[PDB]
Amino acid sequence: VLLEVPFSARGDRIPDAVAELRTREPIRKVRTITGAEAWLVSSYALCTQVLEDRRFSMKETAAAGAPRLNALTVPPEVVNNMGNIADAGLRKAVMKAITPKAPGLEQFLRDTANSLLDNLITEGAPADLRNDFADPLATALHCKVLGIPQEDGPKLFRSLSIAFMSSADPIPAAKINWDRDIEYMAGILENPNITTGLMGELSRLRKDPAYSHVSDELFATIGVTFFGAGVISTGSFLTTALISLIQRPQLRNLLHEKPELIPAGVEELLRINLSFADGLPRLATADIQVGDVLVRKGELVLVLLEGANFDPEHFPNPGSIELDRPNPTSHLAFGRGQHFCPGSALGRRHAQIGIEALLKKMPGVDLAVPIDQLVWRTRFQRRIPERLPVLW
C-alpha cells in the first residue's frame, strides 16, 4: 500500500526513514489515518516554503469534504482561532497576557518547580517526571497566566488526553469536555474575583465599548484553547526534552555546572524535539509547485517539523546538540509564518526554569527503567511517554 503516516509514536529517536525521504523525495504522497492522501514535506527548504505561503491554508483544512489528517476535536471555526482573535481586535492583548514577563510570573514558576521537586524527593525514587513534574508545572503555569484558581487546573488538564487526540473519527468525549470547559470559562468571565491574567484582561475588555460586539463564545474559546494548547505543548515538550537531557549525561553535567548556557541548550532541545506527532496540516487553495510536485488546489499538505529540523543542509550534524550554532533559533519548533506560535516565549521560559530547577535539585537524575520500557501514547497530536520513571 501507499506509505502511511505517522511512521512512529516514539519521541526518543527519529526514524532513519525520515533522512531517506528527505534525500530521495522531500515531498511525496502518503496516506493518513483517515484514508486520505496527502503530501508529506520533509526538507527545511520545502517546509519553509509551505509555511510562508498563505495559499497553503490552515483555516481551509476544516472545510467539509476536504482530505483530512484526523477528525476535528474543536468546532470548525476554531481552526481559525487566531484569525478570529485578530478580527475581534484582541491579538495584542492576548499576546501581552501570555508573555513570561509579568511581575512575579518567573518567580512563581521557580517556586512551583521547586516545590514539585521537593515533594518527589520527600517521597523517594522512582519519581514520574511527566505526571508529577512536567505536566503539573505546565498546568500551574497556565492557571497563573490565565488568572484562574490553581485548584481548577487538574480538571481542566484531564480533558487533554482526549482533546489532543489524532483520531480517524469524531470523538464523543471531546464534545462533552469542550462544552463543559467552555461553560467554565464563561463562568470565569462573569466572576468578579478574576482580575488578573489573560481571563482578567478579557473580562475587562468584554465590558469595554470597543469590544461590545465580540461574542461571549469567542472570549470563552480563547480561555479553553490557550489553556489546552499551552499545557499540552509545554508539558509534552518539557517531558521529551528531559529524556534528551537524561540521555546526554555530559550535557546534563555542563548545564548543571554552567546554568547560563541553559537558554542555548533549550533552544537545541527545541530544534531536536519530536513532540509533534504529525506534520502540520495545510490545504492548498491554488495549484502551487513544491519541489518536483505540482500540488493541486484542494490537496492536503503535511509539514514535517522534524524533517526540517534535522535537515543537514541547514543544521550540520543534525542529531547532535551543539550550543554554538550560528543559526540557533532558525528551527521550526514553533512553526513559521502567519501561524507562528503565540506562546513561544512562554514555552521557552517554562522549559528553562523547569530544567534549571531539576538540575539543581536532582543533578544525578537518570531513567529508572531501560529506555525501551517507556510507553508511547498512540493516536495523539503529541508524542509522549505515559510515565517517565527516574531516580537521582
Ligand code: HEM
Ligand atoms: C514548547 C512549547 C510549544 C511548542 C513547541 C508549540 C508549537 C507550536 C507550533 C509548531 C505551532 C504552529 C502550528 C501550525 O502552524 O500549524 C503553534 C501554534 C499555536 N500555539 Fe504553540 N507551542 C508551544 C507553546 C504554546 C503556548 C504556551 C501556548 C499558549 C499559551 C501556545 C498556543 C498556540 C496557539 C493558540 C497556536 C495556534 C496559532 C495559530 O493558529 O495561528 N503554544 N505552537
Ligand SMILES: Nc1n[nH]c(-c2ccc(O)cc2)c1-c1ccc(O)cc1
Ligand atoms: N488542534 C487542536 N486539537 N485540540 C484542540 C483543543 C484545545 C483545547 C481544548 O479544550 C480542546 C481541543 C486544538 C486547538 C488548540 C488551539 C487552537 O488555536 C486551535 C485548536
